Every structure is written in C-alpha cells, then in structure tokens.
Amino acid sequence: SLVNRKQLEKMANVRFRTQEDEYVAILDALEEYHNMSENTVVEKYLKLKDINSLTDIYIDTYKKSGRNKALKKFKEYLVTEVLELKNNNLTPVEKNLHFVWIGGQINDTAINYINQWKDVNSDYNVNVFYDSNAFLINTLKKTVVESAINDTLESFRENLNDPRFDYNKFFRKRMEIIYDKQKNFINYYKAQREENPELIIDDIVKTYLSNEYSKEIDELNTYIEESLNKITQNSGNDVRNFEEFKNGESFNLYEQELVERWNLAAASDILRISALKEIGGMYLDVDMLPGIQPDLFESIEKPSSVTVDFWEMTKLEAIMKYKEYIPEYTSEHFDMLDEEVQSSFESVLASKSDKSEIFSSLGDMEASPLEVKIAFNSKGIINQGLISVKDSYCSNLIVKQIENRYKILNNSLNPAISEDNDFNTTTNTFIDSIMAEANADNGRFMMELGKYLRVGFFPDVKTTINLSGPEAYAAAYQDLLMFKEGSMNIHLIEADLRNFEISKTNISQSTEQEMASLWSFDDARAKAQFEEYKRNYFEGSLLEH
Ligand SMILES: O=c1ccn([C@@H]2O[C@H](COP(=O)(O)OP(=O)(O)O)[C@@H](O)[C@H]2O)c(=O)[nH]1
Ligand SMILES: OC[C@H]1CNC[C@@H](O)[C@@H]1O
Ligand SMILES: [Mn+2]
C-alpha cells in the first residue's frame, strides 16, 4: 500500500515549520487517493499523476527545503504504487487477433502462419488489416529500385570489375538515383493532388507505372482484383473502413510512410497501435507463430554448444518436418542434428494426433486498463507482439509518442525535401537541421534520425525502431511511470520493462519468416545482393537488345 497522509506527514516532518500551501495540497491529494475505492483504474492513475505533479511543484518552488529528501522518496513510492495498481486490477482482453498486411497481395506463407493462430484460437475473432487503396505500393517500390539498380550498374559499368567499387559504394550511388525517383514520384503525387482527390492511391500509382515503366493496366487490375479477393477470403479488414483511424492525427503519418517512403513496416507500426486502442486484443506480425505447449520437448535436453535461437528454431522445424502444418518450412537447423536427436523429436511428435497438443491457445487473457504488453527478445522489447484492452492508457501514450517523434522528424526533413535538391544535398540540409535543433532531453533521439531517408535502401538502417517502433513503447512506459507525456531521454532498464512484457509461452518468435526482415537487411545480405545484381547484369541484361 502507498503511505497514507499521517505516514507522509511523519516522513516530511520539519519540527516547528509551518505547512506551506503547496505541502498541504500534496497531503490533501494523497488522502483523496486513499478514498477512491469507487473510481476507475484510469481515475486512480490520474490522481497519482496529480499527486506527483503537486510534489514536483513543491520541490521546484522550495529548492532548499528540508522536506525535499522525504518528498523525493515519496515520488519513488508513487512509481511502486502505479505498478501495484497495474498488476492488481486486470480486465478481460477482447478476443481479437490483429494482423497487418498492406502494400500488396498477401503471400500463402503469411496465410499459413495466420491459419496456425485460427486453428488453436477458435474463440478469437481475426482481423487481417489491408488497405484496399494501396495494393500497388510494393510493385511501385520494386519497379523503382530495379530501375535504380540498372541505372547504377550501367553508369559505373567501367568500375564493376574494380574491387574498390564495393557494395557500400554501389548502395551510395543507387540511393542518389532512388531519391531522385522518389522525389519525382512525390512531386508528381502532390501535383496530381488538386486535380481529382476522388482518385485512390492505386489509380495514381497505375498512371506512374503504365506511364514511365510501361506496365500493362490489364494485369495490374487483375493483380488488385486477386489481392482484394484473397484478403477478403482470409479475414480481411479494410483500413479504408476504419473511421477513427482515418479521422485521427496519426493517419497523415500512416500515408507518409505508405505513399512517400514506401515503408510498409512503419505504416504497420502506426496502424497496429490504433487498432489496439480502438478495438482491443492482441496484435501479431505475420511472421509470428503460436506458443509451443511448454512441456512438448521437456524430455529432450538442449545441447550445451548450441544457441537458444538454434534450439527454438529446431523445435518449430521438428514440428513442421513431422506434422507438415506449414508446407515448405525450412529444416536447415533440424538437419544439423545427428539421427539420435532427430529420432527423439520424431518419437515425441509421433504420439500427438491434434495441433492443440503441439501449439497452446491464448484463452481468456487479462491486462491492466493502464498498459500495453509487448514481446521481448535478448536485445529488448519488440512490437511484433502486443496485448491491450480497448482504449488502454498506454495505447494513447504510444500514439502520442509516435506523433511527437514525427513532429520533430518532419520539422527538419520536410524543408529539405521541398528544396528540389538531390539526395546528398537533401541529406546534409536535414542533418544540419538535426544538429541545430538537438537539445539535452531530445538530443540522443536526434542523431538516431540521420539515416531516415535510407530506410529500406541501405544495410543496417533501423530508424523506424526509434520513430514508430520499440523506442516509442519504452518512452510511453517511461511517460506512465514518470506521470508525464513526451519522454525523449529513455532511462528504463530491463527490470522496469519486465512489468510490460508478454510471457514467452504466448508467442513462438524464432520462426523462419522472422529471420527474413521485409524493411531492413544486414551487410552480408547487402554484399550478396550486389554480387547478384552484377551477375544478372553481366550474364543477363548487358547481353540483351
Ligand atoms: O510489404 C509489407 C511488408 C511489411 N509489412 C508489415 O510490417 C511488419 C513487420 O515486418 P517484419 O517482420 O519484416 O519486420 P522485422 O520483424 O524484421 O522488424 C509485418 O508483419 C507487416 O504487418 C506489410 O504489411 N507489408
Ligand atoms: O518498428 C519497425 C519494426 C521493428 N521490428 C518489429 C516490427 O513489428 C516493426 O514493424
Ligand atoms: Mn519480423
């Protein structure tokens, strides 16, 4: 229990000192809190917030006060009490599974993963969010990148056999051309905006494609129709019918990522938290699988020399080898084990006739009205799994974190874009604005933003995580525990974040599709892509008329 008024009066006592008005305000607010049995969890949190605010006013007003040490201890007690309020007052989570697949047709691989969740959660309504207006974004991005690859290989043909023209130099020159093609597209998009705003994204994208890359609108229309038909058959839920999201102050950010940046991961980041806030339930990336029954492989000991990641992937690969639930699932880890260990997996699985004996169900989940729970890995929290009741306090804090992060980004980036200059010029203008605008609080967040323009086009560019992804979640949890909004300087450690984490039992994260990121790539994949592009040029395109 949080200290009562008598107990704080004892802690912050200063003999023969008159009670300041600001001090009595804290004592009155504390006493009111202890008499809020009839009130909601959010009302109780907002009272604690008020008490923390009144305590900060006292400390800021009377800088040298003898009460200040005890009041700073009381501030620690308020944080502890928020955690007790969070952990002790749970309400049911709406039985909704939310997935997002935007920007193009959904692959059978995504559907096969989604179907594993449906099969062991018969009691759950499933939404696969898609955007009926933007099925051609993945096609636009692929077209433009392929064009920029060809133009780079052509322009630097003479240098391609030179090892000093490495993968890094290739991606730098390609980015110059990609930025000009993206600038050409957005200067086109916003010119066309102010002709017929009753044209959907796919309509304007078809004219860019079947103008300047000579694509067949017959086949593009077929692609849209097959995409709409397929998603409609697989629990499709259209973003364009989600009115609170369309009307809200994050929709412009969604459309920025979807249409200007072609970052479907960032767009999914913005949409998923609005789906949780507005509907409640559990969000999952399409590369996530249900938790494995915790004791399924209890009888098989992990080899000492092998990583946790190797062992978790081998368990899913064993399931898919012998039960074949997901066709064409890799066995690349499982195949590294000798016949003895392989046979132990086979004999464990040979005695199970139903998927419910392999994969666990979510069942009846509960969470705090205050919180959003987040998945985690050895590197920290990750928003590939989220649980929230409808209109949770944290869902609102996360939306506002994302909005504030985009406010700061766009304030420095958008001037540069609008000055019709090339990639490197735009980059330096942007970076100069960042270093000029940086302050003590937000400084560290700034400087994580410098590579924003490169997201999806360069190896090891992860800016999305700092804007719409995990950092926004950590900052929202800091907002909740520090009774404020707009935390930019994150000091939470894993002990703090552990209170907001989804149990490992509720998600299998170590899947085949999880190892293949759709919006980022590492140096090894970059080197291999560069070798692939030179091969397809020298042995393919160069030899053609
Ligand atoms: O063309 C795409 C690519 C990505 N995504 C969304 O972005 C999420 C994150 O993708 P990914 O798992 O590649 O990100 P990572 O786990 O590598 O950070 C996916 O689950 C989708 O909801 C999408 O909707 N369409
Ligand atoms: O924030 C970008 C991405 C980070 N990795 C997990 C994904 O769900 C997310 O979109
Ligand atoms: Mn993933």
**Domain of residue 70, residue span:** 4-89
Atom 14 in ligand 1: which residue has the minimum CA distance?
Answer: 517
Three-state DSSP at 12 gives: coil
Are residues 418 and 428 in contact, defined by beta-carbon separation less than 8 angstroms?
no
Report the DSSP beta bridge partners of residue 128. 99, 236
What the block records as the tokens of 312 is 């978790």
- What is the H or E stretch that residue 92 is in? strand 91-92
Are residues 47 and 32 in contact, defined by beta-carbon separation less than 8 angstroms?
yes
Extract long-range pairs of 269-272: CB within 8 Å, 24+ residues apart.
269/383, 269/402, 269/464, 269/467, 269/468, 269/469, 269/472, 270/402, 270/468, 271/100, 271/102, 271/129, 271/239, 271/245, 272/98, 272/100, 272/383, 272/386
Backbone angles phi, psi at 540, to 5 degrees: -125, -95
Are residues 474 and 498 in contact, defined by beta-carbon separation less than 8 angstroms?
no
Which of 360, 376, 405 is at the close of a domain? 360
164 in a known ligand binding site:
no
295 in a known ligand binding site:
no
200 in a known ligand binding site:
no
What the block records as the tokens of 213 is 């890359």
Three-state DSSP at 249 gives: coil
What CA dihedral angle connects 43, 48, 52 and 53, to 10 degrees?
10
> How was this entry determined?
X-ray
Resolution (A): 1.8
Are residues 11 and 23 in contact, defined by beta-carbon separation less than 8 angstroms?
no
Give the list of residues 6+ apart from residue 97 with CB closer than 8 angstroms, or none.
117, 118, 121, 124, 125, 126, 127, 281, 282, 284
Task: Please identify which residue in the block is written with the tokens 């066309």.
Answer: 192
Atom 6 in ligand 2: which residue has the minimum CA distance?
Answer: 384
Q: Are residues 232 and 335 in the same domain?
A: no
Three-state DSSP at 61 gives: helix
State how far the Cα of 248 lies from the Cα of 185, in Å rounded to an integer: 26
CA 319 to chain centre: 28
Which of 303, 335, 360 is at the close of a domain? 360
Buried b (16+ CB within 10 A) or exposed e, 244-278: ebeebebbebbbbbbbbbbbbbbbbbbbbbbbbbe
Are residues 447 and 436 in contact, defined by beta-carbon separation less than 8 angstroms?
no
CA 251 to chain centre: 16
Q: Are residues 269 and 332 in the same domain?
A: no
- Other beta carbons within 10 Å of 175: 20
State how far the Cα of 54 lies from the Cα of 56, in Å rounded to an integer: 6
Q: Which amino acid is at 325?
A: Y
Task: Please identify which residue in the block is written with the tokens 């039960």.
Answer: 323
Strand segments (E) across 141-249: 236-238
Q: What is the 461 CA–ligand 2 centroid distance (Å)?
A: 12
Nearest bound ligand to the CA of residue 106: 1
Q: Are residues 389 and 474 in the same domain?
A: yes
CA 164 to chain centre: 37
User: Which residue in 476, 485, 471 sits closest to 383, CA to CA?
Assistant: 471
Dihedral of alpha carbons 299, 301, 302, 303, sign:
negative
Strand segments (E) across 228-372: 236-238, 281-284, 366-367
Q: Are residues 81 and 138 in the same domain?
A: no
State how far the Cα of 371 lies from the Cα of 476, in Å rounded to an integer: 10
- Ion ligand 3, residue ranges at CB < 5 A: 285, 287, 514
Domain count, the chain: 3
Q: Which amino acid is at 234?
A: N
287 in a known ligand binding site:
yes
State how far the Cα of 229 lies from the Cα of 223, in Å rounded to an integer: 10
Q: Are residues 340 and 472 in the same domain?
A: no
Q: Are residues 373 and 343 in the same domain?
A: no
Q: What share of the chain is helix, strand, coil (3-state, %, to 5)?
A: 55, 10, 35
State how far the Cα of 425 lies from the Cα of 422, in Å rounded to an integer: 5
What the block records as the tokens of 472 is 């926004």
User: Which residue in 8, 1, 6 sits closest to 51, CA to CA?
Assistant: 8
Q: What is the 519 CA–ligand 1 centroid distance (Å)?
A: 7
Q: Are residues 191 and 227 in the same domain?
A: yes
Q: Is 269 in the pocket of ligand 1 (CB under 6 A)?
A: no
Query: Per this entry, what is the length of the chain?
Result: 545
- What is the H or E stretch that residue 376 is in? strand 373-377
Q: What is the 508 CA–ligand 3 centroid distance (Å)?
A: 12
Widest distance between CA atoms in the chain: 96
Q: Are residues 20 and 134 in the same domain?
A: no
State how far the Cα of 329 lies from the Cα of 18, in Å rounded to an integer: 73
Q: Are residues 169 and 273 in the same domain?
A: yes
State how far the Cα of 182 lies from the Cα of 195, in Å rounded to an integer: 21
Q: Report in angstroms the alpha-carbon separations of 259 from 122, 405, 457.
A: 36, 19, 16
Which of 259, 464, 519 best tests ligand 1's pocket when mutated (most atoms within 8 Å of CB)?
A: 519
State how far the Cα of 449 lies from the Cα of 358, in Å rounded to an integer: 43
Are residues 139 and 104 in contact, defined by beta-carbon separation less than 8 angstroms?
yes
155 in a known ligand binding site:
no
Say if strands 91-92 and 366-367 run parallel, antiparallel, or are unpaired: antiparallel
State how far the Cα of 19 lies from the Cα of 14, in Å rounded to an integer: 9
State how far the Cα of 177 lies from the Cα of 187, in Å rounded to an integer: 15
Q: Are residues 139 and 280 in the same domain?
A: yes
- Other beta carbons within 10 Å of 189: 15
State how far the Cα of 49 lies from the Cα of 59, in Å rounded to an integer: 15
State how far the Cα of 410 lies from the Cα of 256, in Å rounded to an integer: 10
Atom 9 in ligand 1: which residue has the minimum CA distance?
Answer: 265
Q: Report in angstroms the alpha-carbon separations of 76 from 47, 271, 441.
A: 16, 35, 21
Q: Report in angstroms the alpha-carbon separations of 528 from 151, 429, 525.
A: 19, 32, 5
Which of 29, 60, 89 is at the close of a domain? 89
Task: Please identify which residue in the block is written with the tokens 């525990």.
Answer: 481
Q: Are residues 272 and 380 in the same domain?
A: yes
Nearest bound ligand to the CA of residue 512: 3
State how far the Cα of 234 lies from the Cα of 227, in Å rounded to an integer: 11
**Burial class (CB within 10 angstroms; exposed 0-12, middle 13-18, buried 19+) of 162:** exposed
State how far the Cα of 320 lies from the Cα of 322, in Å rounded to an integer: 6
Q: Are residues 72 and 106 in the same domain?
A: no
Are residues 269 and 402 in contact, defined by beta-carbon separation less than 8 angstroms?
yes
